Amino acid sequence: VLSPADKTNVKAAWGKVGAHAGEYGAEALERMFLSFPTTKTYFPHFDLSHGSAQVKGHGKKVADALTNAVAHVDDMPNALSALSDLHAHKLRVDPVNFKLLSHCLLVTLAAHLPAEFTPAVHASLDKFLASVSTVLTSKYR
Amino acid sequence: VLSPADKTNVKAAWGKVGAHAGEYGAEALERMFLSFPTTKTYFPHFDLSHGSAQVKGHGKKVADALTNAVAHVDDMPNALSALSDLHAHKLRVDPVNFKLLSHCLLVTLAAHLPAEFTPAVHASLDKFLASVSTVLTSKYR
Amino acid sequence: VHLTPEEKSAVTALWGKVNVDEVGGEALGRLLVVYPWTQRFFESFGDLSTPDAVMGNPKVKAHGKKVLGAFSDGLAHLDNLKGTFATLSELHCDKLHVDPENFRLLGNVLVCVLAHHFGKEFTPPVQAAYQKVVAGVANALAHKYH
Amino acid sequence: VHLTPEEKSAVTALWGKVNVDEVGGEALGRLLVVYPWTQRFFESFGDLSTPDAVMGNPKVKAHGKKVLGAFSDGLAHLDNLKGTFATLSELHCDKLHVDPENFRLLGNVLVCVLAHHFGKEFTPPVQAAYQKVVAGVANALAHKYH
Ligand code: HEM
Ligand code: HEM
Numbered sequence: 001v002l003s004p005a006d007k008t009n010v011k012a013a014w015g016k017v018g019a020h021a022g023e024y025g026a027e028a029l030e031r032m033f034l035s036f037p038t039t040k041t042y043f044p045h046f047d048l049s050h051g052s053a054q055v056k057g058h059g060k061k062v063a064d065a066l067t068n069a070v071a072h073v074d075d076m077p078n079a080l081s082a083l084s085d086l087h088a089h090k091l092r093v094d095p096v097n098f099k100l101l102s103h104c105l106l107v108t109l110a111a112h113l114p115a116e117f118t119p120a121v122h123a124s125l126d127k128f129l130a131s132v133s134t135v136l137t138s139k140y141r
Numbered sequence: 142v143l144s145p146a147d148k149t150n151v152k153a154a155w156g157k158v159g160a161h162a163g164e165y166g167a168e169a170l171e172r173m174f175l176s177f178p179t180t181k182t183y184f185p186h187f188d189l190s191h192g193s194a195q196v197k198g199h200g201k202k203v204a205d206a207l208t209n210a211v212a213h214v215d216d217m218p219n220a221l222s223a224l225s226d227l228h229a230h231k232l233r234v235d236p237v238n239f240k241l242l243s244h245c246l247l248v249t250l251a252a253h254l255p256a257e258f259t260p261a262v263h264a265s266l267d268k269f270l271a272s273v274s275t276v277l278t279s280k281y282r
Numbered sequence: 283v284h285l286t287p288e289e290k291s292a293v294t295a296l297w298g299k300v301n302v303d304e305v306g307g308e309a310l311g312r313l314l315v316v317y318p319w320t321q322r323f324f325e326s327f328g329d330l331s332t333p334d335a336v337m338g339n340p341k342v343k344a345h346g347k348k349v350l351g352a353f354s355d356g357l358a359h360l361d362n363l364k365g366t367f368a369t370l371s372e373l374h375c376d377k378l379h380v381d382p383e384n385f386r387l388l389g390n391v392l393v394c395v396l397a398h399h400f401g402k403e404f405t406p407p408v409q410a411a412y413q414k415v416v417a418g419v420a421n422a423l424a425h426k427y428h
Numbered sequence: 429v430h431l432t433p434e435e436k437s438a439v440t441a442l443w444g445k446v447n448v449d450e451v452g453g454e455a456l457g458r459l460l461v462v463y464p465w466t467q468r469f470f471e472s473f474g475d476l477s478t479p480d481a482v483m484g485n486p487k488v489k490a491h492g493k494k495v496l497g498a499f500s501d502g503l504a505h506l507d508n509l510k511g512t513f514a515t516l517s518e519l520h521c522d523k524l525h526v527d528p529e530n531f532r533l534l535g536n537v538l539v540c541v542l543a544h545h546f547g548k549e550f551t552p553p554v555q556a557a558y559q560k561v562v563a564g565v566a567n568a569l570a571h572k573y574h
């Protein structure tokens with residue numbers, strides 16, 4: 001359950017991220033692939049080298065999905081339904097992996113938002129990404 | 142998201158458990174305390190010895206909560222709201238611990254339901270307990 | 283992992299009773315059914331579209347037998363799981379990149395299968411001993427990640 | 429854990445820059461704020477009712493300093509984390525019964541704090557090296573559970 005304060009915080013952070021959303025998404029993916037090599041096996045057909053146009057393109061899709069979640073924060077299950085279907089049914093993404101990408105998203109925001117990434121906002125973002133992850137794995141429950 | 146088949150399965154299993162619900166709940170707790178000793182630190186004031194009236198009494202409360210969830214399976218967040226408040230805010234139960242008790246609940250049902258604990262029903266019960274756990278930890282998201 | 287002699291007794295006595303031709307396939311089958319993302323690693327097995335398909339799948343039973351063979355081997359060398367599972371770790375970690383949480387899952391599914399098969403014989407202390415064992419095997423299998 | 433020399437370089441170079449009087453308390457404070465169930469183990473610290481209270485809490489800063497001191501010690505003995513953290517494991521596992529998932533959490537919070545403090549300097553490879561380190565420390569601290 002995201003509190004009003006959390007929603008305020010998440011919205012503020014996204015605001016500060018602004019038009020870098022896509023680039024930060026690509027950076028989060030690279031952090032994930034390097035830090036947690038097991039995750040790479042979901043993208044055996046991607047080139048995952050630094051600077052990969054495929055990682056950049058995917059980072060944008062991921063960022064777009066998260067912003068759609070922010071923009072429909074009170075209706076996330078519905079907003080993310082197709083994505084939930086895809087990740088669970090087709091891709092069979094191990095639920096553990098959402099924690100890894102969520103962490104890398106936090107790390108990425110932390111490395112870009114010196115002022116915005118306070119302990120409070122960090123907490124709110126964690127809850128947000130946890131909430132998104134819960135939806136994306138819900139086709140497992 | 143619990144499917145109609147899952148709801149059917151969970152209801153069937155609870156039916157077979159019948160009036161043993163409380164006793165199985167107490168057994169699940171004992172399994173948890175023995176198997177996962179870290180969990181014992183939430184009950185420092187309980188006597189956790191075998192046959193403890195306090196574990197028996199608590200097992201019944203736990204079983205009652207789960208049956209209330211079954212009985213309001215489409216409204217679990219609302220049904221379990223007070224319990225969610227208690228476990229997160231007051232008790233500060235580590236989320237990992239819900240997986241441990243859920244597993245012990247499955248083990249307990251498995252040891253009591255030779256016919257009922259098929260792979261399908263096992264899957265449905267896992268999802269059910271995962272769904273209950275998600276609600277009970279939701280005051281963390 | 284250090285089991286007490288009482289824990290070792292609980293484990294050893296039960297295990298002699300295990301149908302080594304069946305329990306492995308039952309545990310693997312259930313893993314694939316209950317945690318369907320695990321099916322990702324076994325697409326070669328064929329029809330896994332339903333529980334019945336999975337449990338009746340001959341490849342599931344056959345591979346499960348090898349898996350249980352590995353557990354048995356760990357049971358024989360509790361005081362050196364690391365050495366025992368070295369090669370399998372290399373395989374699951376370096377080659378397969380299975381997330382280790384899944385080792386813990388298969389271990390807990392195995393526990394469920396033992397509980398189902400042995401019923402009341404699978405007492406809470408016998409379970410607790412088996413939990414130490416499956417944790418130890420999971421940890422050893424995951425060593426190539428450490 | 430075996431870091432490559434490149435990984436060791438990434439870790440060592442960054443760490444020399446770390447404010448050992450502050451980062452520990454920042455990581456611990458954030459742990460308590462972000463994963464509030466961890467506050468269960470620190471009721472003696474006093475006011476933890478808000479983020480500001482936690483981060484400004486002198487006990488949080490003081491204990492965090494000791495925690496970071498332990499990380500530093502691990503960094504100095506990467507090829508023997510098990511020996512290094514033996515005593516702390518005994519403490520967190522046998523006496524405190526902290527769930528080890530929480531070790532992984534504190535490690536990841538520390539990573540977040542490093543990212544916040546170092547910004548772009550905390551590159552994805554530097555992160556990946558630090559992830560190996562915090563995993564290794566978590567694993568060693570958890571050894572008394574294995
Ligand atoms: C946790 C305890 C586990 C044990 C004791 C175990 C044991 C084994 C054994 C004995 C083999 C046969 C290796 C050989 O032919 O020499 C094997 C292969 C395999 N395992 Fe596991 N396993 C475990 C967990 C898992 C999990 C959780 C997964 C995936 C979800 C997995 C995926 C695989 C795959 C895909 C193979 C075939 C690899 C190949 O033939 O190249 N294993 N395992
Ligand atoms: C994961 C890496 C961790 C490291 C490196 C670490 C390090 C330390 C150190 C150096 C001390 C001081 C021990 C002494 O005074 O000799 C300590 C104490 C303590 N730690 Fe940790 N810690 C970690 C994780 C955790 C976590 C996640 C928790 C709980 C959520 C925790 C709970 C405690 C408590 C309650 C004490 C005080 C115990 C006492 O004074 O009796 N630790 N830790």
Ligand SMILES: O=N[O-]
Nearest residue numbers: 029058059062101
């Ligand atoms: O990278 N998540 O699609």
Ligand SMILES: O=N[O-]
Nearest residue numbers: 170199200203242
């Ligand atoms: O035992 N759960 O309250």
Ligand SMILES: O=N[O-]
Nearest residue numbers: 310345346349388
């Ligand atoms: O359990 N799969 O080897």
Ligand SMILES: O=N[O-]
Nearest residue numbers: 456491492495534
């Ligand atoms: O990090 N608490 O020691």
